[PDB]
Amino acid sequence: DSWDKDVYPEPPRRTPAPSPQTSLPNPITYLTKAFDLLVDRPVTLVREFIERQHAKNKYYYYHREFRRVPDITECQEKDVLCMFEAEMQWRRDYKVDQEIVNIIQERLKACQQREGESHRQNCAKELEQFTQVVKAYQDRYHDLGAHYSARKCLAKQKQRMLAERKAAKEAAAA
Amino acid sequence: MMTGRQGRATFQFLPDEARSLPPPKLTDPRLAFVGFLGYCSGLIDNAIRRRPVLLAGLHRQLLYITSFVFVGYYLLKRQDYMYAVRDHDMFSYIKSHPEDFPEKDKKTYGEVFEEFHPVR
C-alpha cells in the first residue's frame, strides 16, 4: 500500500447496485466502456513498462531517526552546548506537531465531503479530535512570538501550571 | 593600565619572556595583508609620479613589499605578546582573590523562574 490506513481512516464503501427502470440506454455506461478501453488500458500499458524498469534497479531511502537528547529543563543556565541540542530538538518537535494538526484537519475535511448532506452528524469523532489537538497545540505553541524558543515555551508552561495549582488549591477552600 | 606591571623590563620592544611564545607564522593572514599594503603603496608610488603603474620599478615594488612584511612581522610578534601578558595577569589576579570571583551556583532551567510575556 501507499499510505498507512490507520493514520487516514476510511469507512468501507457501499456502492448501491444499479437497477434500471427505463427502456432507454444509460449513456454513461457506454462511455465508461469507451473510456476504460481508449484511456485506461493504454495508460496502464505505459505504466507497466515503466514499472518493470524500476524493479530492475531497486534502491532504498531511509526515514532519518533522531536520537533523544536532554530537554531545556535539564540544562544549566547559560550553557550553550547543552542548550543548543535541547533547543534544536524542540524545533523538530514543533515541526512534527504542526503536521499532526494537518493530519487531523485533513481527516476532518475528508469527513465533511464524504458524508455529504449528513456531515453535521456523522462527523463527530473527527471534530472531537480536531478540538482535542487544537487545544493542546494552542497551549504548547501560541503567543510565543516570531523569536520563539524552548525557554519561552518552558516559561509559558510554568505560567499555566502555577495558575492551575493555585486554582486547584483554592477550589477546596470554596 | 599595563605600565607598571610587576614583571616588566621598561623600554624593550620584545622582552626576554616573549621568546617562550610561538612566533607568528610566515603564512599568517595578518602578515599577508600587511604585505598586500606594501604592494598597494608601490602602485601609488608609480601613479603619483606618472610612471607605468604595473611595470615600472619592479625593484622598487619589491622593496615596498619586503619592508612592510619585515616591519609587520615584528609588530605582530609584539601584539601577541601584549595580549599574552594581559591574560597572564588576569588569571593570576583571579587566583590571588578567590573570594571576589566565586564559582557560580548553577541551577537548571527547570527550576529558575523566568516570566513569560505573550506576543498577542
If you compute the radius of gyration of chain A from its CA atoms, what whole number of angstroms results?
A: 27
Residues B107, A14: Cα–Cα separation, whole Å: 62
User: A111 exposed, middle or buried (CB, 10 Å; 0-12, 13-18, 19+)?
Assistant: buried
| Joined grid coordinates for residue A87 | 533547543
A155–B114: do the CB atoms touch at under 8 Å? Answer: yes
Angle at A137 between CA A105 and CA A129, to 5 degrees: 45
B114–A156: do the CB atoms touch at under 8 Å? Answer: no
- CB count within 10 Å of CB B42 equals 22
B119–A76: do the CB atoms touch at under 8 Å? Answer: no
- Check if B103 contacts A (Cβ < 8 Å): no
Beta-ladder partners of B116: none
User: B72 exposed, middle or buried (CB, 10 Å; 0-12, 13-18, 19+)?
Assistant: buried
Angle at A61 between CA A59 and CA A64, to 5 degrees: 160
A76–B120: do the CB atoms touch at under 8 Å? Answer: no
Provide φ and ψ at A76, rounded to 5°: -70, 150
- For every residue of A148-171, DSSP letters joined together read --HHHHHHHHHHHHHHHHHHHHHH
Resolution (A): 2.6
Residues A129, A123: Cα–Cα separation, whole Å: 11
| Joined grid coordinates for residue A93 | 518537535
Residues B42, B66: Cα–Cα separation, whole Å: 11
Residues A91, A103: Cα–Cα separation, whole Å: 19
How many residues belong to chain B?
A: 120
Deposited experimental method: cryo-EM
**First CA to last CA distance, chain A:** 57
Secondary structure E strands in chain A: none
**Which among B109, B113, B119 has CB closest to A72?**
B109
